[PDB]
């Protein structure tokens, strides 16, 4: 049957934390997953970032059971050139926007002595200027490449991952309906 | 014989402007190029950026004659996955460094009222933090892909292009000795 | 179901000796293994090194029953070139570090007459300088190649084996949770 | 015609320095090379190590002309597993021999106060114990991989490179007769 | 379950004759074999050599029942070239050693008139020089090829068969523990 | 055009020494070979045995020019099983014949005191009993495997190589007419 | 369980007629066969030849019950080429021998007037010269092909069928012990 | 272009001897063959039978040049079962006819004392009864198998080879028009 | 147990009508069939032709109970090409024979005025010329295909169905002994 | 490029005789065919029927050159069952229609004494009743099977071949435009 490529953004994001049976989310997900032989996958890099960020006690055993933890075998894969071209072309605009935001916040800091609030606002604006919208870290690229070779169904709540997975030719799924999808595949 | 993939950074950079017979550089380069049938190439994007930045009157005719202006045919090319992996892994560090520099300059701006000099310093430091060292714009990626399919000899003064062209497997040449190289190929 | 590639470092290392039901470890492992048809594997070279190092009386029969003892069929396998490149590039640094440690210990020996303690310290430092971190002997390479063709789940407590198995594309498992993993696969 | 894969050990080693027309060696080699269209090659890593070690003034131009400087394209190449198996199996013995030599020199240092001469002897013996006989650095592996994909004629004075190039299936040439070989190919 | 490839050297060799319930060995082996559906196999050539050498009255019926008697289907099998290379390379040394032994025994015969004892000693030494250690007859090659296609567990007391079966990639078993192995597989 | 796989038995055997223009044979062969682009080949092992046995001064340069010196790449080749079966089946008979000859010569030595002549006769008879007729050393197997992958025309005066090359499917040529064949291919 | 491929030469040959409970043989065979679900088979051609040669009244019903009567499905089967090569190579010798026997009997007939006895002797000798030893008619080939696809246990008293079934890879059984084999499979 | 599989029956049969330019036939055939790169082939067995039967002085050199002499590689080929079925079914009838002819000639020999003429008549009739019409010797089977793997154009004057080559799926050519066919392929 | 593929020609043909307990035949057949779980089958087309030709009152209920009425699933079945080739090759001869019979009967009609008797004779002869001997209608092809996928035992009194079912590889049964066969399978 | 499967109905039918350059048709077709490497094919059976029906002097040589003459290899091909079902279902109707026509012509013959004209009319009507519309002879089936395995472009003027080739999945071409099609493929 279909093979799902998991991600970190499927059981740590608060909304998908809640839709998954409200620690309990992990075990309910595990029991649901073990049924109907829908093979899952998740790259090692994503695994280590997630475990570093979030930890559950002794429940990891069945998670290692069902969700396989590979690396994409990046030596036999090739990504089309236009993908890289578009990535870098968009990244240049993002960098310029971030520089402009940094400039305007420097002037605002020179204006008034409210340094802490302005630093917090800079954290908000710079991250939205650069990290929001495209592939930011290496975990996302690893998810793409792992899901690209196995012809798997990418599952993510990241809005910068979905568009770039759509450009490459990976079939996507609705992240908000993943729980119901898994349940209906398990039952019927 | 060997085929050279040109770039914008071969006859607009002041040092390579000077080593090329000191407008005169373009025509001397053209005459030298027309000899010995060393086919050149240069992507259209680089051509339009260069002509937008620099303009010479009516000399362009023989430049269109000798230096061919293609596009890489980005539909039949594939770049290895580890290249993209390393690119994005390094880019993340660059972004963090740029954010830290922006922070420290905001605090320095809050410290003293020397806004213009600090803005100039921010222009210097941010560009060195991000744009210096890797593929920044799309013209560089276009140069890589054009030089990658024709097995051409990349010619550039960009230090962020050379390393990434070395990773992919393109044969490079010394940019500082290009004029003498072309002359010795022409004569003997 | 999933197929596990065993190793010597799963039931001779003292910590994994203890977590395995505290000779008793072997038989408890055997009974647990015989259930649920999780096929195991272990190369012959590892087998002979382990039996040479450690011996149990007459219990080997069921071990031959369940844990299959192959050789990787090294004639139909190919390892990507970048793997070898990285291996040798790192090995050069290791060799230089070992030479420097040998030098400094020679000078310390010249300094004072405490030869036995310094020889013991040299044994500690040289092994950490070279053998620790990468593929040292041939048993580890055999484990990699056997686990690479069968798409098996490598199981090892060696920290120099895990990284190099991650580079090649083998799916790994947590060595500390292997007993609980096997139990939960057996029961449910 | 045949394509030769060059190396650093063809015009810096004193003996092959002498057999090559006794700076003069480089230019005589260059003139001989430019004739008869025997395409050469040399990896970038070897090029940078050689130029770092040895430098000639302004003669490099024709060297860039004739001797192409690539990288092996290590993403499309595969090395057979038995090669790696034998490499690591031999390396283990080398490491043990080096450790034993370090031990005996520590005891000799404890014996007498002749530290400088013994350090020099340790430099001689340790390098012979480890670096002599097999692929030591990454430049050699790069030479192998570049010569392996182009079906080129490896040319080296390294006795640890020749055996490992013979195991893989690369055709070799006599390094001592390279000059006469090139001359006779040029003339007739 | 696992499939065993039998041999002649499992119930005619005196030691394995004894460990098998001390004619009685054959029938005890047969009863043990009929249980638990561990499919056996044995090539026809081995069968005819064994029956020619050893004969049991009317017990053969159940032996034909349980131990299947095939031929390897040598038309669809391929043996790697390095196997043949190593076989012949070792055989050359064996032949030279046998010739030297023959020479020295000729001189000893010329020395003294003890012809019968020296002929007996020549029988002992020549057989050890050539037939001992490698694949001698065709029955052994037949056992290898039959066990190689079925992925069976080779069972033999021949020390020249085990190494060559290990080179090819056949999983081996302990010949001395075969009886206990079969019993424990039958019972539990 | 056709590609010839050379051997040691083409220009050291006295008869083919004579038919090749009567040191002079090597150079006449070389000049004839350089014409018409009939690519030759010869394995390294054969090369080292031949150079060890026979040496010519400074003529080797053009020999390295024309006759390529590879190794068979024994990792991607497979030899059919029936070939090995027949080889070993015949070898067993050869070994028994050699043992019988050794026996009868021992008795003859016991008979009379003519030890030197009988030792010489034993050298003659034993070599004819074993080494004559089949693949004896590893150089012959190397010639077979090199000629088997390139679909080359094996050229040898060895009567034990020709039959085994005929069994495998290699196209053979007449060794006595090789000189005239090469000449007529060169001229017309 | 095992599936037996029957033949005509299992219950019409007088010796196997006798060992089968001494018409009575057919019914005893049938009752024994119906037990233990050892599926049998027999080709239609063999069936029609046997029924044409031998007939039993009204007992055929249970024979149609137990012994299935197929045709080999000769459209999906392939026989290795070396089999045909050896068959025809041996057949040529047989034909020549038959011609020589015919010649010598013609001369003997010319010698003396004993025509009837010599004709009887010619019937004896010619049949032994050609039909004895190899596959003579089409029923035997049909038995081979039917037994080859089902991986069945060929059962025949024909000495020319057994060798050719051994060459192809069919597992054989002892024809003289078939009754006892079937009985022991039925009982235990 | 098309590849022709030669035979012995193309330049020894008197009629095709004559249509080929009337020793002269061989050399005219050779010159015609060397043109237009129509690759030929001929099995070794056919070659040795032909050279044993017919010999030409020193002309063989160019024959070895153009007409390649392989063996079919009978280990990777498979012949359909219905082919063998039909072959043996027809052979049985041939054998019976030969026996009947032998009988009637025995009676005729008994009748009258004309033994020599009747022996000659028996030679004529028996050969027509058996050898005429089907694959008689092994050279014909070798021609079939060699022509079957290369998809070559079988060329023969044997009327028992043509029908059996038509059954298997080999494309045939007119043997009487081979000379004109080769000429018209050479010229236009 | 075995599964029988019924036909129309098993309980409408007068002879098999009689051997089946002499309407009574249907019910006796039904009771016999319901025992021992010998699954039957019969295609729908045959069912409708039979019910159209022959009708029994209210007995059909148990016939629908026991004899399953499928269609062959003609979308997943494939018939070998040689079957179709032979069918059409024979059909051509049949058509020509029918035309010749029609001609001769036209001339006989022209001869004498006995039109009715000659028309009756034409009905007899034409049907024997074409419809007798091969697959005539579609019901027979349906029986073949249904019996071919289920590996069932075809049961028919049609002499043109039996030969073509024998060519394809379907196991047949004796139609005259079907009643006794079913009885003996039911009882014992 | 595309491969055409020829037929007899492409250069013997008068209309396609005329459109082909009006003996001259054959040679013009041959010259046109030899250009542009559009590989043709034609089965042997069609070839022998055509040559039997029509003969051209000495022009056959180039016809054997260009139009390959195979047999379909009917052992590796399978035709879908529904094809056979439809063929036989339609054939039954054709047979009944032919019988009715034969009847009515018998009555007309009884009516009047015009036997010759009525026999001619019967020849016209019966052939239209049966042979017209479907696959009549074996040559057509051979054309289908040869064109079915090579994925060739069937070329025929037979209206009963086109529909049945359309049912199976063979791509067809316009027979009336074949000459212009071949010309336009040759020129441009």
Numbering used by the authors:
A (entry chain B), B (entry chain A), C (entry chain D), D (entry chain C), E (entry chain F), F (entry chain E), ...: 1 to 22, 25 to 190
What does the paper say about this structure?
The cryo-EM structure revealed that Aq880 is a homododecamer. Each subunit has a typical PIN-like fold, which comprises a single α/β/α domain with a five-stranded parallel β-sheet (β1-β5) surrounded by nine α-helices (α1-α9). Hence, the region of the two helices was denoted as the “protruding helical” (PrH) domain. The two subunits formed a dimer mediated by the PrH domain, consisting of α5 and α6. The dodecameric assembly of Aq880 showed a left-handed one-turn superhelical structure with six dimers. The structure of Aq880 revealed that the active site of Aq880 contains five acidic residues required for catalysis, which is analogous to the active site of eukaryotic PRORPs.
Ribonuclease P (RNase P) is an endoribonuclease that catalyzes the processing of the 5′ leader sequence of precursor tRNA (pre-tRNA).
